[PDB]
Amino acid sequence: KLKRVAVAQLCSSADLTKNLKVVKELISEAIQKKADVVFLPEASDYLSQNPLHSRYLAQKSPKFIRQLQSSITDLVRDNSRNIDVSIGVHLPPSEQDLLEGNDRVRNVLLYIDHEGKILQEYQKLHLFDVDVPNGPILKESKSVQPGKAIPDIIESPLGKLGSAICYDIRFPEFSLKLRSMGAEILCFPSAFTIKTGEAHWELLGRARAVDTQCYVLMPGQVGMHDLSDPEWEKQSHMSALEKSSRRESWGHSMVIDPWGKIIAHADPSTVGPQLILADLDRELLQEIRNKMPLWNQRRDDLFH
Amino acid sequence: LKRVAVAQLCSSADLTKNLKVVKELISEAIQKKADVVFLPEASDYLSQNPLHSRYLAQKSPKFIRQLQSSITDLVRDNSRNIDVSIGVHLPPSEQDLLEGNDRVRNVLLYIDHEGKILQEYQKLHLFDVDVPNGPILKESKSVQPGKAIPDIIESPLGKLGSAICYDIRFPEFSLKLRSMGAEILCFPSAFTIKTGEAHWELLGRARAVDTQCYVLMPGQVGMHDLSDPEWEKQSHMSALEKSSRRESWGHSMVIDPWGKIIAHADPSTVGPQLILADLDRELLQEIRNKMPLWNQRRDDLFH
Ligand SMILES: C[As](C)(=O)[O-]
Ligand SMILES: C[As](C)(=O)[O-]
Ligand SMILES: C[As](C)(=O)[O-]
Numbered sequence A: 001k002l003k004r005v006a007v008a009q010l011c012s013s014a015d016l017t018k019n020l021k022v023v024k025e026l027i028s029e030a031i032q033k034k035a036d037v038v039f040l041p042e043a044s045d046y047l048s049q050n051p052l053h054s055r056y057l058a059q060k061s062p063k064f065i066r067q068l069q070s071s072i073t074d075l076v077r078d079n080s081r082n083i084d085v086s087i088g089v090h091l092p093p094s095e096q097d098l099l100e101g102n103d104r105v106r107n108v109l110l111y112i113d114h115e116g117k118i119l120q121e122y123q124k125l126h127l128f129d130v131d132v133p134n135g136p137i138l139k140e141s142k143s144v145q146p147g148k149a150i151p152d153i154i155e156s157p158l159g160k161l162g163s164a165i166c167y168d169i170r171f172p173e174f175s176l177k178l179r180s181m182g183a184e185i186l187c188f189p190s191a192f193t194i195k196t197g198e199a200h201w202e203l204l205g206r207a208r209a210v211d212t213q214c215y216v217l218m219p220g221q222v223g224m225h226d227l228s229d230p231e232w233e234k235q236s237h238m239s240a241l242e243k244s245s246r247r248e249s250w251g252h253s254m255v256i257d258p259w260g261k262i263i264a265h266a267d268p269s270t271v272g273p274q275l276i277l278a279d280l281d282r283e284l285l286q287e288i289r290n291k292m293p294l295w296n297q298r299r300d301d302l303f304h
Numbered sequence B: 001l002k003r004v005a006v007a008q009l010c011s012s013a014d015l016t017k018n019l020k021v022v023k024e025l026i027s028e029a030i031q032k033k034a035d036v037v038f039l040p041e042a043s044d045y046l047s048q049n050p051l052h053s054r055y056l057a058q059k060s061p062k063f064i065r066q067l068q069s070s071i072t073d074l075v076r077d078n079s080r081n082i083d084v085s086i087g088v089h090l091p092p093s094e095q096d097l098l099e100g101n102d103r104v105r106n107v108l109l110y111i112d113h114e115g116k117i118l119q120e121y122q123k124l125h126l127f128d129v130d131v132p133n134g135p136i137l138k139e140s141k142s143v144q145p146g147k148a149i150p151d152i153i154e155s156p157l158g159k160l161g162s163a164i165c166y167d168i169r170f171p172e173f174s175l176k177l178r179s180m181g182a183e184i185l186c187f188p189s190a191f192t193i194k195t196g197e198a199h200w201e202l203l204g205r206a207r208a209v210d211t212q213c214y215v216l217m218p219g220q221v222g223m224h225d226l227s228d229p230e231w232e233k234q235s236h237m238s239a240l241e242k243s244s245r246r247e248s249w250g251h252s253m254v255i256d257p258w259g260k261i262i263a264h265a266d267p268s269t270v271g272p273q274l275i276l277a278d279l280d281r282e283l284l285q286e287i288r289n290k291m292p293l294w295n296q297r298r299d300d301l302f303h
């Protein structure tokens, strides 16, 4: 009656090859621990130094993904056991995007099944354009093009999955829509800031969980990112002065039940890659919804 | 800076005794130089059952009229203005009865320093819930749901959006109030212990962070005695059918637009208390400027 989920925490560099190794190891560990699906953070392929760097690295992501698809099938074959993978990546703009003068990268959550088949590419809807309190001005929209579609509910081994990315968590109407469409589980793969993480990360996960009566999965980037890329730095004629980076992610990856209880949480004693596991209870989810029938009580006559 | 008072109390079924407590809290709020005081849901009474509620609701109009007079009296005596936000009940109207709607109204009144009712908000989302490890409650057995989104009130503290208790759980409502211009939201409540321990703080902070508004949370607290000998005699009730015990969560608080609890009820004081907060419009504006959520919504897809 229980379904096992794995949630991964990691620290993306600008080196896709090294990031892939980490990703493959975590998927391998997830199959070992008999997780039905493994969830990895936003930007698990790479993080970049600036908007031009991002577009450069996005050109390498199709290869990363093809290699990942192969790694999944290899791992499924060798372990005699299925697993599905949800993972944040970037993708280059399409020909039509370019025709329309849009050369920004797509911030994409991939769902890949045990056969290495891509079932969904969810393009991030709400982009992180924020002045961080006691921190930098961040404008995701300079590097990333916003999505134009609400992601379909995924029939995963765990149950009905609603997909979202990072900043998406802050717009409750999105999570409300996902539940309305039939979601039982929401995910928010993220590269979340320290300053906003300390304040809101746990609050937002728990809020979305209780709002929607869904399990909430929170795969987060952690630690100080090594964004070094000597070959690109050479190509773009960058001075050592412009080379430096101190980008840092909140981590605190967790799983939350439909009542807002944290049932799994990352170990704070490491800033390296780690996996957390949780057993999801459909009976508990159904009980909670029965006892407090929020979706039978909404005022559609006034809102929406 | 503008000063708000948030009241925590414990309603009995005695409207006369409840009114005395309400008047004392409003008086105390004026002494402390609060410009508006916010009192919980059901500050006029709490009832044993649907039939008791209908009986007590008939007494509510007198309670409200006496409160209106009491507000102008306190303001005059103290030589200082205050506005009052307070949860009460109203009996069904003549038209309600003719239309077969014999249910009481759960209403949040906004009463200004002149004792004028500026708004009568009727609760939109009614508490029909099987409480985990608690009782099975069905508010809609005695209460009729509201028909309107309440207008933003230009209060002395700023733009106020109003809501009642369970309303807090439906984020679209708070989102709409912010879209209408809210700077401050209130959720006067009689909140259960089991859901309170779980969600009270979480939901308040969430709505504040969701909307970049100050959030005010006036709550009922402690064990209620809803005994009413006069009613119990009139309805010829046996002692075995009596349901006079209720418990409320309390933990009344004020929350800033960043989710920080800036005022909170003292857990050591039993019974009626008041918490004060100085609200900062510039902090609110700064938060909204730095994270421009309302310039970033996807109405093309969700609205
Ligand atoms: C990840 As692809 C290049 O098959 O859209
Ligand atoms: C917009 As990003 C997750 O590549 O910093
Ligand atoms: C239990 As009631 C309708 O007085 O809040």
Ligand SMILES: C[As](C)(=O)[O-]
Pocket (backbone or CB within 6 Å): B047, B048, B049, B050, B053, B138, B139, B142
């Ligand atoms: C049963 As009742 C809504 O009068 O507390």
